[PDB]
Design an enzyme around this catalytic site. Structure first.
Site, PDB file in Angstrom:
ATOM      1  N   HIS A  40       0.812  -1.204   0.000  1.00  0.00           N
ATOM      2  CA  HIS A  40       0.000   0.000   0.000  1.00  0.00           C
ATOM      3  C   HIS A  40       0.852   1.263   0.000  1.00  0.00           C
ATOM      4  O   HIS A  40       0.268   2.332  -0.231  1.00  0.00           O
ATOM      5  CB  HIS A  40      -1.018  -0.026   1.116  1.00  0.00           C
ATOM      6  CG  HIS A  40      -0.550   0.399   2.439  1.00  0.00           C
ATOM      7  ND1 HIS A  40      -0.239  -0.438   3.486  1.00  0.00           N
ATOM      8  CD2 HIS A  40      -0.470   1.658   2.927  1.00  0.00           C
ATOM      9  CE1 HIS A  40       0.068   0.277   4.536  1.00  0.00           C
ATOM     10  NE2 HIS A  40      -0.062   1.599   4.244  1.00  0.00           N
ATOM     11  N   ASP A  84       0.131  -7.523   1.865  1.00  0.00           N
ATOM     12  CA  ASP A  84       0.579  -6.135   1.860  1.00  0.00           C
ATOM     13  C   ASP A  84       2.099  -6.089   1.978  1.00  0.00           C
ATOM     14  O   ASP A  84       2.677  -5.768   3.021  1.00  0.00           O
ATOM     15  CB  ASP A  84      -0.095  -5.327   2.966  1.00  0.00           C
ATOM     16  CG  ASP A  84       0.132  -3.836   2.849  1.00  0.00           C
ATOM     17  OD1 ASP A  84       0.583  -3.431   1.770  1.00  0.00           O
ATOM     18  OD2 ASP A  84      -0.173  -3.083   3.823  1.00  0.00           O
ATOM     19  N   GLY A 175       2.327   6.795   8.467  1.00  0.00           N
ATOM     20  CA  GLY A 175       3.684   7.222   8.169  1.00  0.00           C
ATOM     21  C   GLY A 175       4.728   6.195   8.587  1.00  0.00           C
ATOM     22  O   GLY A 175       5.857   6.276   8.137  1.00  0.00           O
ATOM     23  N   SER A 177       3.928   3.007   8.026  1.00  0.00           N
ATOM     24  CA  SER A 177       3.585   1.961   7.066  1.00  0.00           C
ATOM     25  C   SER A 177       4.786   1.555   6.247  1.00  0.00           C
ATOM     26  O   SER A 177       5.552   2.401   5.782  1.00  0.00           O
ATOM     27  CB  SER A 177       2.532   2.407   6.153  1.00  0.00           C
ATOM     28  OG  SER A 177       1.351   2.591   6.875  1.00  0.00           O
ATOM     29  N   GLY A 178       4.950   0.244   6.067  1.00  0.00           N
ATOM     30  CA  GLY A 178       6.022  -0.293   5.243  1.00  0.00           C
ATOM     31  C   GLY A 178       7.287  -0.605   6.039  1.00  0.00           C
ATOM     32  O   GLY A 178       8.162  -1.306   5.557  1.00  0.00           O
TER      33      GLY A 178
END
Ligand SMILES: [Ca+2]
Length: 223
Positions: A40, A84, A175, A177-178
């Site tokens: 995402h 994801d 923020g 995320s990942g």
């Protein structure tokens, strides 16, 4: 990261910032030429920023390297966030040193109760907005599959786990995320989703990296 602590400069040497003019997502360096992040977080025009602490000041340990290719998981579903995960290949190899280093991939999955380190430059407030300049950290345990499913009925797949605190107050956030979830020196998770941040009974939900090691390795071997 809500309810965490300042990591310390370059103490999380596999943490990367994905930059498209601005920080927008975390990632993890898994070898000199490849980063794992969340699907995402996909966009074009990614610059990978390694060796960061303050993302707004050049402090001397940075390496900025453009992505040459992005590979979103073949089965990523953006509606459910199942699968994801994405890989980013760097245009050139990073120079690996004590402050810029790869994180090991898991050989086995992690279990509920294991403590892990979650890191990122995401929001630090749960009922507010404040984005840090320096890297934030949170120690958190993996939660049971059953408590994860109870928190989020009908939403947790076999490619997701929960980590954090059901009481609230401590979580990853927008923020982050990942970015990484590292447990006993292995990348076990990727910051993926959750209802708000640090809310009671709404723990963080993470991509379960151990399910993807075969895909990661074959993808690297052919790209
Ligand atoms: Ca910097």
């Amino acid at each position: 990261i809500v309810g965490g602590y300042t990591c310390g400069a370059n103490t999380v040497p596999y943490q990367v910032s994905l930059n498209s003019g601005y920080h927008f997502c975390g990632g993890s360096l898994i070898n000199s030429q490849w980063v794992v992040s969340a699907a995402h977080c996909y966009k074009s025009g990614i610059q990978v920023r390694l060796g960061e602490d303050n993302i707004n000041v050049v402090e001397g340990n940075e390496q900025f390297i453009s992505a040459s290719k992005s590979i979103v998981h073949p089965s990523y579903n953006s509606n459910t966030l199942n699968n994801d995960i994405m890989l980013i290949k760097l245009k050139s190899a990073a120079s690996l040193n004590s402050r810029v280093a790869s994180i090991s991939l898991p050989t086995s999955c992690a279990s509920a109760g294991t403590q892990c380190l979650i890191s990122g430059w995401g929001n630090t407030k749960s009922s507010g907005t404040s984005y840090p300049d320096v890297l934030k950290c949170l120690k958190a345990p993996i939660l049971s599959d059953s408590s994860c499913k109870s928190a989020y009925p009908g939403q947790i797949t076999s490619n997701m786990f929960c980590a954090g605190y059901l009481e609230g107050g401590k979580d990853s956030c927008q923020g982050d995320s990942g970015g990484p979830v590292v447990c006993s020196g292995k990348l076990q998770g990727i910051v993926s989703w959750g209802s708000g941040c640090a809310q009671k009974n709404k723990p963080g939900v993470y991509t379960k990296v151990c399910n993807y090691v075969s895909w990661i390795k074959q993808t690297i071997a052919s790209n």
